Design a protein around this ligand. Structure first.
Ligand code: TGL
Ligand code: HEA
Ligand code: PEK
Ligand code: PGV
Ligand code: DMU
Ligand code: CUA
Ligand code: CU
Ligand code: MG
Ligand code: NA
Ligand code: ZN
Lengths: 98, 43, 514, 49, 46, 105, 227, 84, 144, 58, 73, 79, 259
């Protein structure tokens, strides 16, 4: 019966484990644990790709169940397009970019 | 693949040298042991 | 700096680099050993004057080429360099454990060299069967040293295998399924699984051999109710997966090279290729007694092992055809790596087909412990595994170093090597059909012509080795730095430049779900 | 502008092939290597007993 | 941080090609020589 | 999959898009030369006009070189294509690679 | 025995070995068929400037390249397994002989009737007589009657050896604590040679096997004379 | 599966502790007592110098080379018989 | 056109048969007169001279298809050098025969071989195909 | 006993450029130097033994 | 002038493949067949012929007189 | 019976290549039979077939080792 | 600077001291077996403990104190540990195979029966049965520990864990005593050989397993574990269950069936 004495993560988790824990509480994903969800990927509704620098590598699985991923660097600026399927991607500095 | 011209070009003469030295580092010590084998068999 | 970086590394690239240096050095040792074998056999008569020493040289040739050259280069070398880069992982799952896998190898190797220096060496064959390997026919420390060398090489590959499987499973972008990984990554994962299961069984068998030799156990000694055949089962239960472990990552690299120089975006039949390597891994656990067809097993067991072994041709056939299918319609670039690959495809097939001959326990009665076996396995190893190692090395060398090789020299190197390994091993078919035993330091005069020719061919491959060292010096000496690499959209490992920075994917890649 | 293989291809091809044939023919036939070829149609059998 | 870039991500220097050649030679040549000398050791041992 | 005629018409349509941008032009040629065929003159004609709308003379020439390359050892294919494009070539002022001396090494 | 520049198998001296010879021809035929087919296709893929570099559908072609090899494997395995069982098959032998491997020589025992046994050592090269074979001759041959089914029992008194005679189609490992059986039947009289086929140490290369196949009547007198 | 019981209501630690003290430890107490009531030595077997037993192909690396590590003089004969 | 090693993350120029229209122009900076040529390109292409057309092509692309697909004489060097080094290996073999191998066994003496041949024929080695089958026992000679 | 985890979290997170195996202070450094001395002294001794065993001494 | 007729323009590689793959089989089989009848049937015939007239006692007697046996002089 | 012995016949209890147990079993049976008789004033010759069979199949050193062991009271098979 | 959740490990000397310590131990064993000296071995064992101590200390620092074990890292550690146990299963398999091979086909030198002539097996209903109940009992108390930990109950976790440790120790003493009393030894043919090598490796794993539990008990005393994050505890518990199961198989095969 009764008796605690075991600390919880809320009380004792620290460093990155603590950051991931707090960020998930506010439904945020700054350490890229989850797959992001595609938009329609048109010029008007591009996939927004957060980054803390001015470029990030994108992998495009053009069609569900392709075995081949298309890799290319996405730079800050106008949306760029997967050279295979043309879906649009745009780098958003920040969210991350602290 | 494309490449920059050599920063430190290795001229044909320099190749001859690197090649000759490479071959001798392999050949001489083995050749020396093989040459003296019959010496080693029964001393 | 130097010590922190190179002795205390937690970086997958540096450690892959250390594997490559180690395996290159071991390869020279194993090459010298292979030349001492051919010198002994190159004319009738006795050259060394001591068949214990010829036995030691043959046994050490095998351990060296397998545990210290092939595995460290393919799994430790290319595996650590390319796996994290192919799935966008910032390093291996266990970066400090990774470093101990590497550091186990120099001392393991030292123990192997020690064994051939104390007493009269371990003249046992790489199979180290008792009673020959036991404490009467091989009294003293040499065989114990060999056993401990195998222990440490086993602990190394087991921890490495756990690291690879963990990394490949857990450290991919969350959107990427296993059916989106490149074939090289698959080939490593599969290999790591075969390592994980097979090496503990070897470690068990050779521990029993150790206790027979020093603790008065009688696992293998009929005077105690023990049975030398039990050793062979344990050994080969590891040994057959071991041979698949030696070729799988080779398969992996072949698929990457042939695709690349064909200018294709992916191999033909990706899912057939994954299925083939899986099927090969599975069947590789249930065929081992085809190394035991003359020990006196019952006929039904031999019928079963013959039948199960043949079946392996089917999935392997699917890979060979799928590589041809990849070439089909290609924009073929005749790079030197492409040349190694093409040579690989044809010479591996020939080595594979002589294995199908050996698979018949019927015919194996007559071919077992002959040079036909030796021809079979140097085809798939020295023109399968080695060719894949050379093709991957010339293909990825600019990515590891940031420098280019001289292509023309590299083609000269392939040409000489192609002639030397065929001249060496081709006539050994005749030797084994006509009845020449393996592990002989001299032979009946009838067998002289093929042996003389085989030994001349081994000197030609020596010249190719010497050249290769000069070719690598030339690259470093001239410093042509890489500018641009084609097809980076389907070859992620090149996308961080050459050489890539010490930390890559500090920010991981972005891949949408959809 | 003409490259290394342009200036020197023929010379390399011709001397390499020639040097290679000469030295192998010399090696195979003049230094006493014993090939032990088939005695069939070459050797006259002699009584042994 | 550590040095990065060509000639920097290896535990040996390629700053001088002649010194590089001497080192390569020692490194590959010691591996190649070793078995010939182990064979000699065994012969001389008895 | 889809018929010949349907394939040809898709590609013609693709290149006739009035506001085609340079990216789309490249993407279309680069994709098309992946197939086991030499494209129909009416596809090439549409691609040439796209070049003209994008003010890109050099790409029109490059397209012609590619047609000849894809024919590989079928030496008859290229002169036939040029014959059928002759009106467009004359109209737009497009020189062939041979006329420019670009077929020579 | 092998002869200089031989490419294939030694001529069969037993019906089992003849059977292996034809089975090997069937198989190598197939080996030639496959490797030439692969070599031709490799050439075909590399000898055209035509390209097709977009995706190709795998899922019809893989059938052919899975069924065809499975049929071919069945064509090798049917005859291979026929011979295996035949190698094992019900013999009723007329004589049993035992051979025991040692480091480094063989001893033979014929104990059906009288306790006969003897050791069989290689003739050193310096003691060969003109016309004798370097590394193959023994001082005491295994004398056996031709045209009879003989049971051979093989074991060892020390490490592993393996008793082999290629021209009879025989190889059976010799294992201490164990009796392995093989059946031997020669269609012809004469001398047939083999060599220890499991590495057994320093003199592995130098412990040959010579059988002397003669008419029963000679075998009987030879046995009496060897007691 | 199944044994003779229930439990899936009030959970966790309490059920596992119930099992630890209600079943697990009492089984240990019972097997202990059962060991106690079957202890008291067996006569040492008669010595026969069987060649498949008392193997010595190399001396042990301790003591006089002839005693196994947990040698019990009462029940473990040497190759030449019981000691003293 | 000076490609830099740190441009690796930027789209790049390739010549490949199979990727005829690469991601960037061969030349990206224009001089005064090249800017004026690009202005001309905007007018009718009938007005450009041959020189002008060629120059436009050379600003867009580095090599033409003909240039990129040209064959070379590299094969001569590679086959010739391979041969040279193979010939070189024969010198090692000569060295080995001379300074390393001692005499071969006396069973290779011509006299020994003639007698051993005879013995092999008397025991009818490989009488079916291999050896003795090629001896004509009646005429006492190798079958012609 | 007392929960002292927060203090160690603070100690081991202190930004002093030290690697984790030395962050605990003088004691880490000693244990580290003792381990390294034993391993290198040991290896040297095992080399000496190997060289020694590589010859017969009767 | 005279206009050129429209040649085949589609599926050129597949056409080359359909033709040669029949040759590939022809040559494969050819090589197999050659082995079958230049070696394999030749071997059946050599063995059949060798033992058709073979007398093991006659063979022994010859070997006996040439002095090869230890057990039979 | 069978003063006709040429060699041990096929024995379907030991149908495989490993014939170790065939030697061993016939050795036991012989000696069991010899001790079954001799004890009860009987004639050993009913055992003879077991003896001929083991003598055909067993290596001399196995036989001789096992006899030495019976003589010393260390033979491990039950007779 | 990272925006992944993985751990970049500070450069470390422990892999190299570990590797060296492997060389000293095997060198040592060889020197011991052949040249009668234990000095190298002692040295190797010493540097091996120090390496283990420091390396796993550092793991505790990286995790409990620095917070690097995010859920992605923790998930890798679960895989690693499972895979490690699998490799330990295949290791024991080889000794089970040795046992089944010897006992299903006993050779003539054995008297051609199992157990061999002259071997007097232990009664499986006696101490081996007690040992069985003892390891099974500790599988129950360690499950009690786990649930006390998950429900945040410090006291009862420490008490279930103490009990599990005590039973581990008891098994180890019962087994030592049985060893001393056994009338057959490791040198009694393949019977003593398969018995002592298979159960001796197992006993060594009971020792390693008890040690790991002791480590968890002290970490628990010091409040390292949270009610949701205590992987060293879960790993020690899988490993404890593994040791338990391998004993069951020992008991059914060697003590019971093989008696
Ligand atoms: C395959 C690797 C590369 C090969 C190149 C390197 C080596 C050069 C050899 C290059 C020449 C290769 C041509 C085949 C030689 C087979 C010899 C033979 O008659 O075979 C017979 C048996 C023995 O059988 C007999 O008992 C009856 C023979 C009748 C005896 C009368 C003498 C007639 C002589 C005719 C042939 C002489 C050969 C001597 C030749 C000795 C020189 C080495 O031997 C065997 O089984 C040998 C086992 C080999 C298993 C691998 C086979 C796959 C190779 C792929 C070939 C594809 C097309 C080639 C395409 C060729 C592309 C270059
Ligand atoms: C990487 C090394 C490697 C590989 C991949 C293999 C692959 C195979 N090996 Fe081999 N082998 C060894 C290394 C290897 N081997 C070594 C080292 C030994 C000796 C161990 C010792 O004694 O020292 C040995 C020994 C060995 C033996 C022992 C013979 C003896 O000792 O008497 C046997 C017998 O079955 C065997 C068979 C096979 C088979 C069937 C394959 C197959 O996996 C091959 C499959 C590939 C193909 C078949 C060709 C490609 C397929 C097609 C083109 C499709 C159509 C084909 C058909 C329809 C037939 N091998
Ligand atoms: C208390 C129960 C727990 C058991 C552990 C206690 C002892 C320490 C040993 C543990 C190491 C593991 C086992 C090695 C094998 C032997 C242990 C068998 C258990 C045992 O201790 O067996 C004893 C014999 O021990 C002997 O030789 C002792 C000899 C000890 C020398 C060890 C030899 C080193 C073996 C090498 C290990 C390498 C394998 C590693 C593989 C690495 C994986 C890749 C039994 O004593 P006995 O007097 O013969 O019989 C009883 C008579 N009354
Ligand atoms: C008397 C002396 C004789 C004994 C001889 C040798 C002794 C062996 C020592 C026994 C093993 C001790 C292992 C202790 C490891 C402590 C490290 C640890 O437990 O680290 C944990 C991670 O697991 C991890 O690394 C996983 C670590 C797993 C290690 C697995 C242990 C098996 C190793 C044994 C080797 C077997 C070889 C046998 C074959 C011969 C840390 O994460 P958490 O627990 O979540 O804590 C953090 C929380 O605070 C978060 O809020
Ligand atoms: C398997 C790989 C082996 C391939 C063969 C190596 C090819 C030859 C390399 C040269 O080797 C040298 O040859 C000399 C003989 O030509 C030896 O000198 C010996 O002979 C000389 C002249 O007779 C004396 O001057 C020397 O002192 C004496 O050591 C010398 O030591 C040895 O280095
Ligand atoms: Cu006896 Cu090899
Ligand atoms: Cu195998
Ligand atoms: Mg063998
Ligand atoms: Na020799
Ligand atoms: Zn896409």
């Amino acid at each position: 019966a009764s008796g605690g004495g075991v600390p919880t993560d809320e009380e004792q988790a620290t460093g990155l484990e603590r950051e991931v824990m707090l960020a998930a509480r506010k439904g945020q994903d700054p350490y890229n644990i989850l797959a992001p969800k595609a938009t329609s990927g048109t010029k008007e509704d591009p996939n927004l790709v957060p980054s803390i620098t001015n470029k990030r590598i994108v992998g495009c699985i053009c069609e569900e169940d392709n075995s081949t991923v298309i890799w290319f660097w996405l730079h800050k600026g106008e949306a760029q397009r997967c050279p295979s399927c043309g879906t649009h991607y745009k780098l958003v500095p920040h969210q991350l970019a602290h | 693949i494309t490449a920059k011209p050599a920063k430190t070009p290795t001229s044909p003469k320099e190749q001859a040298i690197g090649l000759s030295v490479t071959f001798l580092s392999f050949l001489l010590p083995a050749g020396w042991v093989l040459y003296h084998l019959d010496n080693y068999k029964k001393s | 700096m130097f010590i922190n970086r190179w002795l205390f590394s937690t970086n997958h690239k540096d450690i892959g680099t250390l594997y490559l240096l180690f395996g290159a050095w071991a390869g020279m040792v194993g090459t010298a050993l292979s030349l001492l074998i051919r010198a002994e056999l190159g004319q009738p008569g006795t050259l060394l004057g001591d068949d214990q020493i010829y036995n030691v040289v043959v046994t050490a040739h095998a351990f060296v080429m397998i545990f210290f050259m092939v595995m460290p280069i393919m799994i430790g070398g290319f595996g650590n360099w390319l796996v994290p880069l192919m799935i966008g992982a910032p390093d291996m799952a266990f970066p400090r454990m990774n470093n101990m896998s590497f550091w186990l190898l120099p001392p393991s190797f030292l123990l192997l060299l020690a064994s051939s220096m104390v007493e009269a060496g371990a003249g046992t064959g790489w199979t180290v069967y008792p009673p020959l390997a036991g404490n009467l026919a091989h009294a003293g420390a040499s065989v114990d040293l060999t056993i401990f060398s195998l222990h440490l090489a086993g602990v190394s590959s087991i921890l490495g295998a756990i690291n690879f499987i963990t990394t490949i499973i857990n450290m991919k972008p969350p959107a990427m399924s296993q059916y989106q990984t490149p074939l090289f990554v698959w080939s490593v994962m599969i290999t790591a699984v075969l390592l994980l299961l097979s090496l503990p069984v070897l470690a068990a068998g050779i521990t029993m051999l150790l206790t027979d030799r020093n603790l008065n156990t009688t696992f293998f000694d009929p005077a105690g109710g023990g049975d030398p055949i039990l050793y062979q089962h344990l050994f080969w239960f590891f040994g057959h997966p071991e041979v698949y472990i030696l070729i799988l990552p080779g398969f992996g690299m072949i698929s990457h090279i042939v695709t690349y120089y064909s200018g294709k975006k992916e191999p033909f039949g990706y899912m057939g290729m994954v299925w083939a390597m899986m099927s090969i891994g599975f069947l590789g656990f249930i065929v081992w007694a085809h190394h035991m067809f003359t020990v006196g097993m019952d006929v039904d067991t031999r019928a079963y092992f013959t039948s199960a072994t043949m079946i392996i041709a089917i999935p392997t056939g699917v890979k060979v055809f799928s590589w041809l299918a990849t070439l089909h319609g290609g924009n073929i670039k005749w790079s030197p790596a492409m040349m190694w690959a093409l040579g690989f495809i044809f010479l591996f097939t020939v080595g594979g087909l002589t294995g199908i001959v050996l698979a018949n326990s019927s015919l194996d009665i007559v071919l077992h412990d002959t040079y036909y076996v030796v021809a079979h396995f140097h085809y798939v190893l020295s023109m399968g595994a080695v060719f894949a190692i050379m093709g991957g090395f010339v293909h990825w060398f600019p990515l590891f170093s940031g420098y280019t090789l001289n292509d023309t020299w590299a083609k000269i190197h392939f040409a000489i090597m192609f002639v030397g390994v065929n001249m060496t091993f081709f006539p050994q078919h005749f030797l084994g059909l006509s009845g020449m035993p393996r592990r002989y330091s001299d032979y009946p005069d009838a067998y002289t012509m093929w042996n003389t020719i085989s030994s001349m061919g081994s000197f030609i491959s020596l010249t190719a080795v010497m050249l290769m060292v000069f070719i690598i010096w030339e690259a470093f000496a001239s410093k042509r730095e890489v500018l641009t690499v084609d097809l980076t959209t389907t070859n992620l490992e090149w996308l961080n430049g050459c050489p890539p920075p010490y930390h890559t994917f500090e920010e991981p890649t972005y891949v949408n779900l959809k | 502008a003409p490259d290394f293989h342009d200036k020197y291809g023929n010379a390399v091809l011709a001397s390499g092939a020639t040097f290679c044939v000469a030295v192998w023919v010399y090696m195979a036939t003049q230094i006493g290597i014993e090939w032990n070829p088939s005695p069939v149609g070459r050797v006259t059998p002699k009584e042994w007993r | 941080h550590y040095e990065e870039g060509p000639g920097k991500n290896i535990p040996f220097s390629v700053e001088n090609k002649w010194r590089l050649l001497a080192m390569m030679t020692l490194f590959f040549g010691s591996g190649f020589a070793a078995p010939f000398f182990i064979v000699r050791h065994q012969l001389l041992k008895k | 999959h889809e018929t010949d005629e349907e394939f040809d018409a898709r590609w013609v349509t693709y290149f006739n898009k009035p506001d085609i941008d340079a990216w789309e032009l490249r993407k279309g040629m680069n994709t098309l030369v992946g197939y086991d065929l030499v494209p129909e003159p009416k596809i090439i004609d549409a691609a040439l006009r796209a070049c003209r709308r994008l003010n890109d003379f050099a790409s029109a020439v490059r397209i012609l070189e590619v047609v000849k390359d894809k024919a590989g050892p079928h030496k008859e294919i290229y002169p036939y294509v040029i014959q059928e494009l002759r009106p467009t070539l004359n109209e737009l002022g497009i020189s062939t690679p041979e006329e420019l001396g670009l077929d020579k090494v | 025995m092998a002869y200089p520049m031989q490419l294939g198998f030694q001529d069969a001296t037993s019906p089992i070995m003849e059977e292996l010879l034809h089975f090997h021809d069937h198989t190598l035929m197939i080996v030639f068929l496959i490797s030439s087919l692969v070599l031709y296709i490799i050439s075909l893929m590399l000898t055209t400037k035509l390209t097709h570099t977009s995706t190709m559908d795998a899922q019809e072609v893989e059938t052919i390249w899975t069924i065809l090899p499975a049929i071919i494997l069945i064509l090798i395995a049917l005859p291979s397994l026929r011979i295996l069982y035949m190698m094992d098959e019900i013999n009723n032998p007329s004589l049993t002989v035992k051979t025991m491997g040692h480091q480094w020589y063989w001893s033979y025992e014929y104990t059906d009737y009288e306790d006969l046994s003897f050791d069989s050592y290689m003739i050193p090269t310096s003691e060969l007589k003109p016309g004798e074979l370097r590394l193959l001759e023994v001082d005491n041959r295994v004398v056996l009657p031709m045209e009879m089914t003989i049971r051979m029992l093989v074991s060892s008194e020390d490490v592993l050896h393996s008793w082999a005679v290629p021209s009879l189609g025989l190889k059976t490992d010799a294992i201490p604590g164990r009796l392995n059986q093989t059946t031997l039947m020669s269609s012809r009289p004469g001398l047939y040679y083999g060599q220890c086929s499991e590495i057994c140490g320093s003199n592995h290369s130098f412990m040959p096997i010579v059988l002397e196949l003669v008419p029963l009547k000679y075998f009987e007198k030879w046995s009496a004379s060897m007691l | 599966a199944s044994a003779a019981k229930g439990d899936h209501g009030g959970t966790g630690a309490r059920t596992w502790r119930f099992l630890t003290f209600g079943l697990a430890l009492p089984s240990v107490a019972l097997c202990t007592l059962n060991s106690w009531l079957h202890s008291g030595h067996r006569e040492r077997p008669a010595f026969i110098p069987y060649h498949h037993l008392r193997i010595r192909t190399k001396p042990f690396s301790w003591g006089d080379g002839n005693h196994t590590f947990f040698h019990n003089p009462r029940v473990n004969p040497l190759p030449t018989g019981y000691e003293k | 056109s000076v490609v830099k090693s740190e441009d690796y993350a930027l789209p790049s120029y390739v010549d490949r048969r199979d990727y005829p229209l690469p991601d960037v122009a061969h030349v990206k900076n224009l001089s005064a007169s090249q800017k004026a040529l690009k202005e001309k390109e905007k007018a009718s292409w009938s007005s450009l001279s041959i020189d002008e057309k060629v120059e436009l092509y050379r600003l867009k692309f580095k090599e033409s298809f003909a240039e990129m697909n040209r064959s070379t004489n590299e094969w001569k060097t590679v086959v010739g050098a391979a041969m040279f080094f193979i010939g070189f290996t024969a010198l090692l073999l000569i060295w080995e025969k001379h300074y390393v191998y001692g005499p071969i066994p006396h069973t290779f003496e011509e006299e020994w071989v003639a007698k051993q041949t005879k013995r092999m024929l008397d025991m009818k080695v490989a009488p079916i195909q291999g050896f003795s089958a090629k001896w004509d026992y009646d005429k006492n000679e190798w079958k012609k | 006993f007392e929960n002292r985890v927060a203090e160690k979290q603070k100690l081991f997170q202190e930004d002093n450029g030290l690697p984790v195996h030395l962050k605990g202070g003088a004691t880490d450094n000693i244990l580290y130097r003792v381990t390294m001395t034993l391993c290198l002294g040991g290896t040297l001794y095992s080399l000496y033994c190997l060289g020694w065993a590589s010859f017969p001494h009767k | 002038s005279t206009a050129l007729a429209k040649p085949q323009m589609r599926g050129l590689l597949a056409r080359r493949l359909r033709f040669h793959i029949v040759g590939a089989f022809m040559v494969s089989l050819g090589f197999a067949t050659f082995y079958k009848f230049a070696v394999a049937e030749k071997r059946k015939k050599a063995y059949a012929d060798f033992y058709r007239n073979y007398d093991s006692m006659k063979d022994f007697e010859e070997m006996r007189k040439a002095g090869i046996f230890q057990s039979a002089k | 019976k069978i003063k006709n012995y040429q060699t041990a016949p096929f024995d379907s209890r030991f149908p495989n290549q490993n014939q170790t147990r065939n030697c061993w079993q016939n050795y036991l049976d012989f000696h069991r039979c010899e001790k079954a008789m001799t004890a009860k004033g009987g004639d050993v010759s009913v055992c003879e077939w077991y003896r001929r069979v083991y003598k055909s199949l067993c290596p001399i050193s196995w036989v001789s080792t096992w006899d030495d062991r019976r003589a010393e009271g260390t033979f491990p098979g039950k007779i | 600077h990272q925006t992944h959740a993985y751990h970049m490990v500070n450069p470390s000397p422990w892999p190299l001291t570990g590797a060296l310590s492997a060389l000293l131990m095997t060198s040592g064993l060889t020197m011991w077996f052949h040249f009668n000296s234990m000095t190298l071995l002692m040295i190797g064992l010493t540097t091996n403990m120090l390496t283990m101590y420091q390396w796993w200390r550092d793991v505790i620092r990286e995790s409990t104190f620095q917070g690097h074990h995010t859920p992605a890292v923790q998930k890798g550690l679960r895989y690693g540990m499972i895979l490690f146990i699998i490799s330990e299963v295949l290791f024991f398999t080889g000794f089970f195979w040795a046992f089944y091979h010897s006992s299903l086909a006993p050779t003539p030198e054995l008297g051609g029966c199992w157990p061999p002539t002259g071997i007097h097996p232990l009664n499986p209903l006696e101490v081996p049965l007690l040992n069985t109940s003892v390891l099974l009992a500790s599988g129950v108390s360690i499950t009690w520990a786990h649930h006390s930990l998950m429900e945040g109950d410090r006291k009862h976790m420490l008490q279930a864990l103490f009990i599990t440790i005590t039973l581990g120790v008891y098994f180890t003493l019962l087994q030592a005593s049985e060893y001393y009393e056994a009338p057959f030894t490791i040198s009694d043919g393949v019977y003593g050989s398969t018995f002592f090598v298979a159960t001796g490796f197992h006993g060594l794993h009971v020792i390693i397993g008890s040690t790991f539990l002791i480590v968890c008990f002290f970490r628990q005393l010091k409040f390292h574990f949270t009610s949701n994050h205590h992987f060293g505890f879960e790993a020690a518990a899988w490993y404890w269950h593994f040791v338990d199961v391998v004993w069951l198989f020992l008991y059914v095969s060697i003590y019971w069936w093989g008696s």
